[PDB]
Design a protein around this ligand. Structure first.
Ligand code: ZN
Lengths: 49, 58, 48, 286, 70, 94, 191, 69, 155, 280, 159
């Protein structure tokens, strides 16, 4: 009950080491940062997130 | 910088196509995708300057 | 309103499709008896 | 166990409010409360706390009351509001540890096996003492010494999550802050660092005085670490490190010369534009 | 105070930001932008943005809660 | 016995003090480094040993007083130079 | 009939390791506190009761609560594996009473001593003077060891009951038939 | 709120669903139901705010299979 | 009596919080409370500590702390407020009061009203009076009448 | 008839604001609520000394979300601790909805005001409270008879009540028609501010730690190369200045790079040599 | 209280001062403004140690901000026209943590050096106006410049 669920989208681009252009499915697109502990190397464009 | 900071915290205005200036105080305008409303005009904007099918801000 | 989900006075929920909006599984208001509600009739519902 | 205790700037405010609230008439000078927070087998952060009705007697410093049932009831309320936080340890002001700390810690050990004490100093906030965290350990005193309890110091940090950093920032924004570190604030930071080093050195020297005259017993690991520090001091003689001159001169060029030249040339150009614009206006005055 | 104001302006460019299309420039500081949420907004352009980089249909990041062309 | 003023000690000092031949000083320092007592290095060409060792001991209250005096020197240097920096930068510290 | 908050003082010292009562001296004091708490609660339904141990430290296992069941449960699992420390126990109990919920409750504690109190008479008399200063009706009951109602306890009560004081009745229990009726004849009638 | 469970992934299982507000939604924990049958297409009732599968409800239809009674 | 715009705070006194330390059993706490010749007498020594709580928060202006003429009326009074816990004589002597009061002789008479620092008594929930000494330096002190003049904060 | 002055303020303590923000965020996207304790000092002051959260209920934020047992027991045990402050008002979070009072919010506020005429209903947007600005407002109400009779809701005697302008979002949701905004001031004494200062008070150490010398050299190289390109641009632009009557600047960027270079290298040099001479 | 202070302005009579101090001690927000202002008016330009200590102590003891403003203007008035004799008080008010007391310090600079044009007072006022963290104090600091400089109006727009 403490989980809130999450959007799902596809990473479009790596704007910089922190800013990721990410498109939500059937919705708008954002620039969003990643979690503090994550494998940015595996955040290739097109990777569903 | 402070003025820009202040004005940058106010919400954006919807653009809309005015269907027609109904009255001297009311204007029928269609804004995508909410639909069509009959808005009022603030003090600065003159009604006679409002012409049909012109993009206005709400 | 859509399938009755076989209420039998213990599961009175029905899934209803609000037009181009979503569909929700909901329950009745106290003012309507289940006999008045059946699959495929237009029903007016609250918003939350 | 725990190698770090992170204290959010809300248990700090909670402690300060508790201290003022009691000390309106509560001249025990030292108040005790319970601090909750998310637990980790790694760095532990604390995010909330409450204050239990505590009493202490200066006689023998062993007679005291901490309302454990009140502790349980507040913890029940906080769990109902936010079950994510569990009891992590207990705090008390009065930066001088009394005798009950370990004993009281024992009482806290039943509600939290790895109960950490966190002294949150209120009044003295001169240089670097926001909070100090201790954890009880099970060893007599050393390899060859009698029994004791011997709270161990743990590194403590102050950190906030989002929607709590915003409150701190908003309460701040006096003439303070300026997160961008300009040269003046950096030199001020150097001065503050020298002050802190001098203060720590004076504390160590006071301890060595209290040991040399026999007021304090010899702590062997203290002396061992003093020897380690004294040996760790580098040497600015030995003309191989003196070739650090090299990089200092290297620093100079990029800074100093180049930057100055550019700054000086830009200022001179700005003077040309003004000395032109002024004569333009004067000639127009025609 | 100038340092603090610059810090605040830079902070307004934080994340997340919604992507939109720079439909049309209206004034030196205000534009019309089509946010990919599917909606056209009359918003205010941040000064530090390079004006020559503002071309029609260019992708622009807008403030999440104000749609200001960040 | 050498408080880092002259960390380089020649093999003659070890040979005479430890009453050993200068051929075995290599093995002696060898063993000392191996067992973890000391962390220096050996310059055999000039017959010296650099010493950065981390094995402390009990401190002989007179020795504690001497170390306290050394700390007094250190703290007075730091204080004098904090005063210097503050006086020089008084314009910009504000 | 009288509003009151009582801090019963159970003993779990190693001198409770006795068979003076048939099963166990500790068990005898256990049902003693049981019956005394029942009597106090049923006598006045809004009275307060709390529990204090005295072995090697004075734990405060149960504070002032009108409930009896929880104090009874805490009384079990007591494990008399310590040594008594009377002065600190009464100090803790007194300040615990100082933390009482209702201020109209007359202060009173129930203390079960079953070991010879190792102390000095001076600290006992000064503590009795302090307790009388705060108007606290300490009630002391001697158990276990044969030096029943020692001169220490006598002086403590008498100084505390200075000229018909609170009623710190120094009841004596026989080393043998420490039955409940013998544990309630004197106190319920008069502490 | 009704939703079509798009599929189930491994992390001890997670899900991704498509709610009737034309929105895909990833759930680290699959609500308050079992997690074995859970067909990729199994219509479910997922909470309207915290978006976890509160219940499973019977399938709607397969178009033409309704066309024949 | 009492100054215009104020009232006696007797009806606002909560008996559940009232508690007097060092009182003789024959001379009850209600004797000082009541406006009778009956008096409250300390039993152990001259020091006394009386805590009075109120149903609702109240603001105090003046106190009528009066006793007999035999010198056993109070002379030094430390007033504390909003005490979360019962007060101890040792701490009360040690603690800094909300207001210290050197009761002159004229206060003890029947017409004796002692003004209080109204600033510090704006959120009084419970007020504790520590009588440290008496005029005649007897072994005990008597209080013929004690009360409080003030107004409710209208909670 | 007495009228509430427009100069009345709500003095929120630092602790109250922090607890309110933390609880409001912790419940996102739900709307959380709790009770604000304090005191009505006078007719022009409402002091919020502390605020305790309340357990989340499926009802949402209503007068049925205040569990009487929770409130009573929390108040009693806080009074035991030493916080015997009355329930001044209530707070709840409108996440992303701005600061205003809905119909049910107005309803619960009527309930609270029945307890005491002075009672505020502060609300906080926890997701609009991005670092820097804090989106929070406090409204009481307007009596319907007061408004229908034509009299203004609040008497005015100073400019204090009009230093800040009302928001459009609040105004459409009934501001100045059913509820009025009350100015909010934050009571931050010296002690609390100094305690909060420790959040980013760096250390006595980082004033003395040199930058990674290889990293320092690399940063110097990169900035000097950028400054070279900027100098080329500056020369090119200045050549245009001549053949151009009064009619991004390669200069301003140049000045910024110069300033960052001098501050970095001056600091590094001074720190290095202070280190050389304080550490033997 | 306002009317009495206006009537007794500068007379420094002890009876009126006692009555107004009693009203101030009654500690009401509405009457506090008038009581503090009238304390200033009655004991105006008197430099009285007793009145000033009573008023500053009350300003540091009470919790109603209206009383704080009234007492601020009162403290200013008490030290009117005393020039450097105010300096001690001025410092004791410039350093105070309460922003209303700092505003009182600015008003005291104005009343003490009214018309003298004393450059030390102007320096302090400008420093506060450009440095202080509370906007009301900055405002009052700028206001006090008029009282300082009214004897040389030509120099006033320049600053
Ligand atoms: Zn709401």
């Amino acid at each position: 009950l403490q989980s809130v669920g999450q959007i799902v989208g596809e990473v479009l681009k790596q704007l910089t080491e922190e800013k990721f252009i990410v498109k939500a499915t059937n919705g708008p697109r954002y620039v969003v940062g990643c979690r503090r502990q994550l494998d940015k190397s595996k955040l290739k464009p097109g990777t569903r997130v | 910088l402070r003025e820009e900071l202040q004005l940058l915290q106010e919400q954006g205005s919807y653009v809309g196509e005015v269907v027609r200036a109904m009255d001297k105080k009311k204007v029928l305008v269609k804004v995508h995708p909410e639909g069509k409303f009959v808005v009022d005009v603030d003090k600065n904007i003159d009604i006679n300057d409002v012409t049909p099918n012109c993009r206005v801000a709400l | 309103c859509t399938k009755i989900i076989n209420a039998d006075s213990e599961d009175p929920k029905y899934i209803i499709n609000v037009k181009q909006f979503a569909k929700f599984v909901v329950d009745l208001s106290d003012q309507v008896a289940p006999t008045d509600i059946e699959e495929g009739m237009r029903v007016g519902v609250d918003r939350n | 166990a725990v190698q770090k205790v992170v204290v959010h700037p809300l248990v700090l405010l909670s402690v300060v409010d508790h201290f003022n609230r009691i000390g309106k008439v509560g001249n025990q000078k030292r108040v005790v409360g319970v601090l909750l927070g998310s637990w980790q087998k790694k760095v532990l952060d604390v995010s909330n706390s409450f204050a239990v009705p505590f009493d202490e007697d200066d006689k023998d410093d062993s007679v005291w009351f901490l309302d454990h049932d009140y502790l349980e009831n507040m913890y029940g309320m906080f769990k109902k509001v936010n079950a994510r936080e569990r009891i992590v340890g207990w705090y008390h002001t009065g930066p001088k540890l009394h005798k009950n700390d370990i004993a009281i810690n024992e009482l806290m050990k039943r509600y939290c096996p790895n109960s950490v004490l966190v002294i949150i100093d209120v009044k003295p906030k001169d240089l670097g003492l926001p909070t100090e965290a201790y954890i009880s350990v099970e060893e007599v005193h050393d390899d060859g010494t009698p029994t004791s309890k011997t709270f161990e110091h743990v590194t403590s940090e102050i950190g906030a999550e989002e929607a709590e950093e915003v409150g701190v920032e908003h309460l701040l924004r006096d003439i303070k802050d300026t997160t961008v570190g300009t040269l003046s604030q950096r030199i001020t930071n150097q001065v503050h660092g020298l002050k802190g080093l001098n203060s720590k050195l004076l504390d160590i020297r006071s301890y060595l005085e209290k040991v040399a005259t026999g007021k304090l017993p010899i702590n062997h690991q203290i002396i061992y670490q003093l020897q380690d520090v004294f040996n760790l001091l580098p040497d600015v003689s030995l003309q191989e490190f003196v070739k650090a001159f090299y990089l200092k001169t290297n620093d100079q060029m990029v800074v100093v010369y180049l930057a100055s030249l550019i700054r000086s040339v830009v200022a001179l150009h700005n003077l040309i534009n003004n000395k032109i614009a002024n004569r333009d206006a004067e000639k127009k005055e025609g | 105070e100038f340092l603090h104001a610059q810090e605040e302006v830079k902070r307004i460019q934080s994340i997340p930001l919604v992507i939109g299309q720079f439909l049309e420039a209206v004034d030196q500081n205000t534009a019309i932008v089509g946010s990919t949420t599917g909606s056209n907004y009359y918003v205010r352009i941040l000064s530090t943005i390079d004006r020559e980089l503002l071309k029609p249909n260019a992708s622009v990041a807008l403030h999440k809660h104000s749609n200001a062309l960040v | 016995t050498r408080p880092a003023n002259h960390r380089q000690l020649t093999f003659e000092e070890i040979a005479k003090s430890a009453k050993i031949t200068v051929n075995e000083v290599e093995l002696l320092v060898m063993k000392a480094l191996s067992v973890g007592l000391v962390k220096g290095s050996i310059d055999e060409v000039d017959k010296r040993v650099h010493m950065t060792w981390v094995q402390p001991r009990v401190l002989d209250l007179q020795q504690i007083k001497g170390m306290k005096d050394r700390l007094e020197f250190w703290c007075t240097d730091v204080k004098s130079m904090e005063m210097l920096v503050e006086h020089q930068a008084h314009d910009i510290l504000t | 009939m009288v509003l009151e908050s009582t801090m019963v003082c159970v003993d779990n010292s190693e001198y409770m390791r006795n068979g003076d009562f048939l099963p166990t001296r500790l068990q005898a004091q256990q049902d003693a506190v049981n019956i005394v708490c029942h009597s106090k609660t049923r006598s006045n339904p809004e009275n307060n009761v709390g529990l204090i141990t005295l072995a090697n430290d004075c734990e405060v296992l149960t504070t002032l609560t009108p409930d009896t069941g929880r104090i009874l449960s805490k009384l079990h699992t007591v494990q008399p594996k310590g040594k008594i420390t009377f002065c600190t126990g009464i100090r803790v109990a007194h300040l615990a009473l100082k933390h009482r919920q209702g201020k109209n409750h007359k202060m009173r504690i129930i203390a079960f001593v079953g070991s010879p109190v190792e102390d000095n008479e001076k600290d006992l008399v000064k503590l009795a003077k302090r307790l009388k200063k705060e108007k606290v009706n300490v009630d002391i009951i001697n158990f276990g060891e044969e030096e029943v109602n020692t001169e220490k306890l006598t002086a403590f009560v008498n100084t505390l009951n200075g000229k018909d004081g609170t009623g710190s009745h120094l009841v004596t229990v026989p080393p043998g038939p420490s039955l409940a009726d013998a544990l309630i004849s004197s106190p319920i009638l008069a502490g | 709120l009704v939703s079509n469970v798009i599929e189930l992934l491994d992390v001890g299982k997670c899900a991704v669903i498509k709610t009737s507000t034309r929105q895909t939604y990833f759930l680290p924990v699959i609500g308050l139901v079992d997690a074995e049958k859970l067909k990729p297409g199994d219509l479910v009732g997922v909470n309207k705010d915290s978006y976890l599968i509160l219940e499973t409800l019977p399938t709607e239809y397969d178009s033409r299979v309704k066309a024949m009674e | 009596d009492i100054p215009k715009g104020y009232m006696d705070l007797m009806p606002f006194i909560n008996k559940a919080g009232c508690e007097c330390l060092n009182e003789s059993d024959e001379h009850g706490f209600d004797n000082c409370l009541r406006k009778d010749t009956t008096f409250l007498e300390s039993d152990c020594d001259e020091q006394l500590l009386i805590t009075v709580a109120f149903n609702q928060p109240v603001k105090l202006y003046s106190m009528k702390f009066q006793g007999p003429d035999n010198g056993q009326g109070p002379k030094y009074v430390k007033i504390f407020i909003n005490l979360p816990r019962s007060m101890d004589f040792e701490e009360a002597e040690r603690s800094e009061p909300t207001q210290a009061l050197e009761l002159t002789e004229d206060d003890i008479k029947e017409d004796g009203i002692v003004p209080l620092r109204y600033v510090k008594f704006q959120n009084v929930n419970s007020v504790t009076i520590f009588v440290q000494s008496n005029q005649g330096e007897e072994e005990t002190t008597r209080i013929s009448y004690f009360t409080f003049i003030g107004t409710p904060v209208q909670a | 008839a007495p009228a509430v002055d427009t100069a009345e303020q709500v003095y929120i303590s630092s602790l109250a604001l922090l607890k309110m923000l933390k609880h409001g965020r912790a419940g996102v996207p739900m709307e959380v609520m709790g009770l604000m304790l304090g005191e009505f000092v006078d007719d022009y002051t409402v002091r919020v000394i502390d605020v305790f959260a309340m357990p989340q209920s499926g009802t949402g934020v209503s007068v049925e979300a205040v569990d009487p047992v929770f409130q009573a027991k929390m108040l009693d045990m806080l009074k035991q601790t030493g916080r015997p402050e009355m329930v001044v008002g209530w707070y709840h979070s409108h996440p992303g909805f701005g600061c205003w009072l809905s119909g049910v919010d107005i309803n619960t506020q009527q309930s609270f005001e029945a307890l005491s005429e002075r009672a505020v209903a502060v609300v906080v947007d926890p997701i609009q409270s991005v670092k820097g600005k804090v989106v929070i407002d406090a409204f009481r109400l307007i009596n319907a008879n007061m408004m229908v009779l034509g009299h203004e809701p609040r008497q005015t005697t100073s400019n204090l009540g009009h230093l800040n302008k009302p928001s459009i979002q609040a105004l459409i949701h009934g501001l100045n028609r059913h509820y009025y905004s009350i100015t909010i001031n934050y009571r931050k004494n010296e002690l609390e501010q100094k305690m909060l200062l420790n959040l980013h008070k760096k250390s006595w150490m980082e004033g003395l730690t040199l930058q990674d010398y290889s990293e320092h050299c690399k940063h110097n190289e990169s900035v000097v190369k950028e400054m070279l390109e900027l100098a080329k641009n500056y020369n090119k632009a200045v050549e245009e200045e001549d053949k151009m009557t009064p009619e991004q600047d390669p200069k301003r960027h140049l000045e910024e790079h110069v300033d960052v270079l001098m501050t970095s290298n001056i600091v590094q040099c001074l720190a290095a040599m202070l280190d050389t001479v304080v550490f033997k | 209280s306002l009317g009495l202070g206006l009537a007794a302005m500068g007379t420094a009579r002890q009876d009126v001062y006692d009555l107004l101090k009693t009203n101030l001690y009654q500690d009401d927000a509405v009457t506090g403004e008038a009581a503090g202002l009238a304390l200033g008016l009655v004991m105006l330009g008197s430099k009285n140690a007793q009145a000033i200590e009573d008023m500053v102590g009350y300003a540091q003891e009470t919790q109603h901000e209206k009383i704080l403003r009234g007492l601020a203007v009162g403290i200013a008035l008490v030290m009117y026209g005393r020039m450097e004799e105010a300096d001690a008080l001025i410092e004791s008010l410039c350093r105070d943590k309460d922003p209303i007391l700092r505003r009182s310090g600015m008003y005291t600079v104005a009343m003490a050096y009214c018309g003298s044009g004393n450059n030390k007072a102007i320096r302090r006022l400008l420093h506060v106006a450009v440095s202080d963290v509370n906007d009301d104090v900055r405002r009052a600091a700028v206001e006090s410049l008029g009282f300082i400089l009214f004897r040389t109006p030509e120099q006033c727009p320049s600053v």
